[PDB]
Amino acid sequence: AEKPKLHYFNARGRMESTRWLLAAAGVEFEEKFIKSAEDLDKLRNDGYLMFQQVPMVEIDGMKLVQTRAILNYIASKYNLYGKDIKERALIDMYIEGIADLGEMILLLPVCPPEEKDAKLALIKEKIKNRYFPAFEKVLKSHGQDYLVGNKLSRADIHLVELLYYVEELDSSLISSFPLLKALKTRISNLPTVKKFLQPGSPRKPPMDEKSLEEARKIFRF
Amino acid sequence: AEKPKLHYFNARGRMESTRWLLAAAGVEFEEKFIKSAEDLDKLRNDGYLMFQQVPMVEIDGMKLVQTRAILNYIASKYNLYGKDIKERALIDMYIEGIADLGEMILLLPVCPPEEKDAKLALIKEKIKNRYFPAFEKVLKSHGQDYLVGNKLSRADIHLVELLYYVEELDSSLISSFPLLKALKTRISNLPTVKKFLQPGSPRKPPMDEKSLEEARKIFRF
Numbered sequence A, B: 001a002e003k004p005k006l007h008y009f010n011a012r013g014r015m016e017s018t019r020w021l022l023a024a025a026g027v028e029f030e031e032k033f034i035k036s037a038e039d040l041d042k043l044r045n046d047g048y049l050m051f052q053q054v055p056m057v058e059i060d061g062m063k064l065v066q067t068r069a070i071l072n073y074i075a076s077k078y079n080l081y082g083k084d085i086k087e088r089a090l091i092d093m094y095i096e097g098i099a100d101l102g103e104m105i106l107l108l109p110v111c112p113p114e115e116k117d118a119k120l121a122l123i124k125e126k127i128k129n130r131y132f133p134a135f136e137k138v139l140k141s142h143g144q145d146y147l148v149g150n151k152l153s154r155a156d157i158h159l160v161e162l163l164y165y166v167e168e169l170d171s172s173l174i175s176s177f178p179l180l181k182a183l184k185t186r187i188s189n190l191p192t193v194k195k196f197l198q199p200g201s202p203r204k205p206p207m208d209e210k211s212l213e214e215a216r217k218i219f220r221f
């Protein structure tokens, strides 16, 4: 209990951006998986989850419960949040555009089957016209290697993680965006991220039929 | 252009928590309203909106675009974000539970009319069982006047703003939560917030038939 213990089920879900921030920061974590609905209710009843939900992360003696509260703490603790407030204002504006798009991709497996391909067509229109041009534009304006202060931050890890999810959606979207392609390569070869991308890591896979089935059972949605 | 200029339409919407944070911090702002869809496209074409959307806030020479990026900057600039990172980790966990609930109430006027009362019944179940007990519990644990460091922060203004929206939904929900009732009274009598609650302020009203009509026209949803 010096190693962060991330409480969640065995899936990408809402824990994955934390798994990537901690691993890129070189921190080693421990995971306690929720296998059943009763695993989640025990957690609730013991007073571990402030709003009855997970992600939950035991770190520095706190039972931290919200995604954005978990990430903001880790990003500050490990110097991945910029040097001053004008610098983390640019990081929050970029990474919140990334969480808007990321929420669309995250929830797409739960979409009503009629809607599913209309939603997917809308997510590809947003990537082409709105989100990727915006980020191509900040990398093109300063011509530096990193999104914000010519120093690695959480905006780069949160953006590259998303570029991996968009590549699984359709590997053709990124092709007209050369500076994003370059940033993906670059952050993917950093030793901490490279370790994480390798075959034995705590990194999780796409949601399939059986994970979504387990997710509906545990979280009763 | 020393006064922040908040760009949005003339409604509560996603700008209202900024209107409350700035006003409680004693800052005076200016508002440029979007009246039409073309008012929004001019803004887009001039390169003011990074992801083609509003809220947008011109502050300290930045055209800041995301809600959480706007609020995090103002809250840091005006000392409303806690003293250290363990203190803003508690503020982010509390205020993100408040934004979950607040998103439900915000979007309720746009819900499909079949669904509307089932959604409203669900929001009242969440308030009674999940969100208000959680906050009653932190005020009861330390017995202090403020949610986080016995000093006013953004967690108190964001929570009281919500207690006003829940009171318009159903004035009976808060009654079994005495310490929240007390915090509402207390923050409402601070001179900056009191000024804002008074009849001539930049504070906005509930969404009605005609505001939602104007909102669908400007934002094409």
Ligand SMILES: N[C@@H](CCC(=O)N[C@@H](CSCc1ccccc1)C(=O)NCC(=O)O)C(=O)O
Pocket (backbone or CB within 6 Å): A013, A014, A052, A053, A054, A055, A065, A066, A067, A068, A106, A107, A215, A219, B096, B100
């Ligand atoms: N805003 C919260 C959201 C948390 C949340 O919704 N958690 C879900 C689990 S994450 C849900 C999920 C499942 C499948 C795919 C994506 C997300 C949960 O615990 N549900 C039980 C409850 O509400 O009582 C956060 O970011 O931490």
Ligand SMILES: N[C@@H](CCC(=O)N[C@@H](CSCc1ccccc1)C(=O)NCC(=O)O)C(=O)O
Pocket (backbone or CB within 6 Å): A100, B013, B014, B052, B053, B054, B055, B065, B066, B067, B068, B106, B107, B215, B219
């Ligand atoms: N995550 C963004 C969300 C921004 C957003 O959705 N903005 C809307 C305006 S806010 C929408 C709204 C309307 C009525 C009631 C609640 C919210 C917008 O500009 N839409 C145009 C577009 O997407 O191209 C934020 O927090 O800033």
